[PDB]
Swiss-Prot record, chain A:
Protein name, entry field: Nitrite reductase
One GO MF term: hydroxylamine reductase activity
Bridged cysteine pairs (disulfide): none
Cofactor(s) listed in the protein's UniProt record: heme c; heme
Curated annotation (Swiss-Prot), chain B:
GO MF, one example: nitrite reductase (NO-forming) activity
A GO CC term assigned to this protein in UniProt: periplasmic space
Protein name: Nitrite reductase
Main location (coarse class): periplasm
All copies of domain Cytochrome c, residue ranges: 10-95
Quaternary structure note: Homodimer.
InterPro entries named among the record's database cross-references: Cyt_c-like_dom, Cyt_c-like_dom_sf, Cyt_cd1_C_sf, Haem_d1_sf
Coiled coil: none
Length: 526, 529
């Protein structure tokens, strides 16, 4: 006989459930099928059994599962409660409306009591806000001295950082929908406001229309299917919008359309919201939240990430499972093109904009499913025949690429290969010389930088990910992402010589992943 | 379970599926998606177990004169389907299904392609003076000559027929039923008939046509109670072009609402937009139909319980009742925003499209009567020339009694007609109140009214005749009222001479079964009210 799975009173079950959706669902999923954390459905957990679940929740694991019991985040009774709850069938995922957001909303420092000018000595625009994935923190690193200025707690499941248009406020979002607002002008920068906007979420963005600096922030959730516009100084939740709706092509109701990347228009006072499963791109005008104007653009399903072109007018985003790039004109508020990249699973991040020597302005992306790099023409006025067409496709290090990067002041295009199965490749970066490109059909050659080897890290599984440039566009940073119980680092590459500039190492630099330069993020320079 | 005490004569899964399809397709328009009843009674298990199999089988077989079709004896459901349904109704209520593009397209039929239709009117009818009258329990509409008063044609649309609307040019007649059935009729044919049809949901009430200058006959839109959605359709073929879900957040508490019904739908005359009331979330949508792929909409926070409403006399401002909250919500359709929300001081305002007129002392006003009390309320509708009266309730006075549904006037007339359809007294419910607009002063003295004995003029005694909804002819000189009696009883339409307030003519015919809504082509196509 299989061990006995205990009762649980209504109160206990209600208590367990609140904990699950508030603190576990960001990594284990609202239906318990897993996300960064393993699936915890009862077909799996009953086999593991109570003792095993209790031990894991008490001690955590170095692969990213918090030590709930030993950290005192959960009491001994709460730990047993959760182990017992995981042996039961998955509960119905709850909604998360205004009442729930406002209960979680905290303003630690009201706007009137914050500084009126920068009170620290830091070079805010050249700071790098780095995600410490399994530590639940971000590191604020000086872009010139390479010193860790501070390490701030945001919360387990920390995902990425974004900056307000003025560069004063640092916004961080976690996979649980937790949002932290950090005031960079304080003597000792810390969280001045926080709020939770759902159970699962990935994106956040700030108002970037000139004249709307610091007015609003917007966050998108995976569950429930909604986005929220918040006050840009206090995080007060002002407008919640459901994304449930019809698919663009079959026009069938879809009960769970996740919000993916959220960007901000520089032509109009609008947020640009990708709705994944229905294939809709939303242009949301924040001029008036009560008489709310939006444009719901039929695009392509599987929208994920993307970026604005060099002129900041057009939004280019990957509909990744269908291998397409979708192009929106933010000035006219309309779809302008849909093109296949020729590769498998394009994953641009915000992508890489540059001026090709013969094609004109282009935007590039690499792929998760193959080694190709694709370029799309982005200049309807000056290069009409090249506009929104794939002009070239060439191989980089290998499949498993996540991020491509460049900067106006650099002649090089950097491509990672983070998820490649071969350590030599996943620990390296491909670099192309833009000035040597000809678009004559021949594959441009690349130099291979041994980033992980340069950091002196071989133990564990160090994966190199995401180039990020400093404010001047002279140095590019890469994360050497190793396990929490392993040695990690950040490698700074001298852009002009393509030589190692510096290796950042520190006991607090745990699982570093996303890196965001204040100036480059606030101005959308990529 | 079937052999257990509490147990019911099961249907295999497949039999259940067939019954469930019949239920949602043919019964839910009147009995409700959760079987809680609408026009038809609740059919939930609590009640149906006490009727028992044989009662249900006979009720579904024979029907009744209250509006329930005789599915069995008409041949509409074969012998076995009746039993299936009777068995089905004893079971727990199924989860209401979605109704997307695939299901709409399966129901979409184009009987006469546009290429094959007339290029000019091929009958000799006076189309703009025609009246389209809903024959409720007959599942038909009657097309009636507005001057000779003869029934030109009786057309089958479907059980649960609700109301009629006209395309902007007056050529196409659109009718919607409570089951979401949409019929398009071409009034230019020698013998006008349905040229296209489609189904847009399981439960629905509204339909409307594009009225922006330049977009005449381009689009039609239908709104549903279930599923919670509206659909924009091609104005000539009924092809479903865009389906939009109305599921979303309430305007005030900002909490998700899984089933926000679509109530009235009107059309802007200032922008190429449809005006959609979303009842439970309290949102009014301004939907721009110039580009359905890059869809522009304005989601206006208003007040919950939005139901019916109309445009002011200038056609710029939408005025709609949030009925359970006793409020009028006013939207500026030129600027696309909320401009006011006001309490009428009455209970449950039910304006229909309302009544616009020029009050001698207040200026332009729009009026509504109420279901819950005898009051008539007036709101100022001219912010430009009468800014101190604009969007203010300027007067409130009594008409015949509570239970009023429709109030009506016309630019060519000085009278304001008010019905009292649901009043418990037959004496009141068979009459209509009429106020002289020219004698109104606005000093706080209730305007007096003349009582027209509309049911008595009809010369009907049997059943329980109720008078509903004034509708004028094209020239604004005669106003029609429906004398709604039961299906197996005699009904009529009464035509009143506006200038003398005397009986003009009584329309009676064997085919005139339960006449309710009446829509004059010209006054509907132009929004004259
Ligand atoms: C929707 C989304 C965005 C765009 C945010 C915005 O527009 O504000 C994004 C951006 C990002 C960006 C933005 C980079 C930029 O330059 O804009 C980075 C670095 C990033 C690093 C990672 N992402 Fe993130 N990421 C997801 C979703 C997203 N990632 C996932 O659904 C996914 C695949 C799985 C998951 O469970 O979360 C996932 C896993 C990862 C990682 O494993 C990465 C590599 C490392 C990590 O920190 O967990 N994601
Ligand atoms: C949403 C809605 C509209 C506006 C449509 C538009 O904007 O195109 C409307 C209009 C109407 C109009 C339009 C009048 C006008 O001048 O615009 C009429 C005459 C009408 C006669 C009736 N309505 Fe209708 N009506 C409902 C809903 C609606 N009715 C109901 O939810 C309700 C209360 C119950 C029901 O189950 O359907 C209902 C019962 C009735 C009746 O019992 C009426 C009186 C008679 C009948 O035919 O069933 N409704
Ligand atoms: C992300 C920051 C996490 C949060 C928040 C929670 N969990 Fe987790 N959990 C996470 C990971 C990455 C893993 C896999 C660890 C590994 O060593 O591979 C886990 C694992 C578990 C387990 C063990 C499951 C198994 O071994 O099959 C359990 C029982 C579990 N997690 C429970 C749990 C609960 C109850 C949480 C809320 C208190 C919770 N986790 C949060 C990542 C994350
Ligand atoms: C609107 C046109 C209807 C449609 C379509 C269907 N029904 Fe109906 N039904 C309707 C009314 C107005 C009434 C009340 C009749 C009365 O005399 O008061 C009914 C009643 C029933 C009943 C009897 C309930 C009772 O007596 O308490 C049953 C079992 C019933 N209806 C079933 C039914 C089915 C199975 C239908 C689909 C084929 C159906 N109805 C359609 C109005 C309308």
């Amino acid at each position: 006989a299989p061990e006995g799975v205990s009762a649980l009173s209504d109160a206990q079950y209600n208590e367990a459930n609140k904990i699950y959706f508030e603190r576990c669902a960001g990594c284990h999923g609202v239906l318990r099928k897993g996300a960064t954390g393993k699936a915890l459905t009862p077909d799996l957990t009953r086999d593991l059994g109570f003792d095993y679940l209790q031990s894991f929740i008490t001690y955590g694991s170095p692969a990213g599962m918090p030590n709930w019991g030993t950290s005192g985040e959960l009491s001994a009774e709460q730990v047993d409660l959760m182990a017992n709850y995981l042996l039961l069938d998955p509960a119905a995922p709850p909604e998360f409306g205004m009442k729930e957001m406002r209960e979680s909303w905290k303003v630690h420092v009201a706007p009137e009591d914050r500084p009126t000018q920068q009170e620290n000595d830091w070079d805010l625009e050249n700071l790098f806000s780095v995600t410490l994935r399994d530590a639940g923190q971000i590191a604020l690193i000086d872009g010139a001295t390479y010193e860790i200025k501070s390490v701030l707690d945001t919360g387990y499941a920390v995902h990425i950082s974004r900056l307000s248009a003025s560069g004063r406020y640092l916004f961080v979002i976690g996979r649980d929908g937790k949002v932290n607002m950090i005031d960079l002008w304080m003597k000792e920068p810390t969280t001045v406001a926080e709020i939770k906007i759902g159970s699962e979420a990935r994106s956040i963005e700030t108002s970037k229309m000139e004249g709307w600096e610091d007015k609003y922030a917007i966050a998108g959730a995976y569950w429930p299917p909604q986005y929220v516009i918040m006050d840009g100084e206090t995080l007060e939740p002002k407008k919640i919008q459901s994304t449930r709706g019809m698919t663009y092509d079959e026009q069938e109701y879809h009960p769970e359309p996740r919000v993916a990347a959220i960007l901000a228009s520089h032509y109009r006072p609008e947020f640009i919201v990708n709705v994944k499963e229905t294939g809709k791109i939303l242009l949301v005008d924040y001029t008036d939240l009560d008489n709310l104007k939006t444009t719901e653009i039929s695009a392509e399903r599987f929208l994920h990430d993307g970026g604005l072109d060099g002129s900041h007018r057009y939004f280019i985003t990957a509909a990744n499972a269908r291998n397409k790039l979708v192009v929106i004109d933010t000035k006219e508020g309309k779809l302008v093109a849909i093109e296949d990249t020729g590769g498998q699973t394009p994953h641009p991040g915000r992508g890489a904009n540059f001026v090709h020597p013969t094609f004109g302005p282009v935007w590039a992306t690499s792929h998760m499913g193959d080694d190709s790099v694709a370029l799309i023409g982005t200049d309807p006025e000056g290069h009409p025949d090249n506009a929104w067409k794939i002009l070239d496709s060439f191989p980089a290090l290998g499949g498993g690429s996540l991020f491509i990067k460049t900067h106006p002041n650099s002649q090089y295009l950097y491509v990672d290969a983070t998820l490649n199965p071969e350590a030599e490749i996943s620990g390296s970066v491909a670099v192309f010389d833009i000035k040597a490109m000809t678009g004559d059909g021949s594959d441009p050659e690349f130099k291979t930088l041994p980033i992980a080897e340069w950091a002196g890290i071989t133990e564990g599984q160090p994966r190199v990910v995401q180039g990020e440039f400093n404010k001047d566009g002279t140095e590019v940073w890469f994360s050497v992402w190793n396990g929490k119980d392993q040695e990690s680092a950040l490698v700074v590459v001298d852009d002009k010589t393509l030589e190692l500039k510096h290796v950042i190492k520190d006991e607090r630099l745990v699982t570093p992943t996303g890196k965001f330069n204040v100036y480059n993020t606030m101005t959308d320079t990529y």
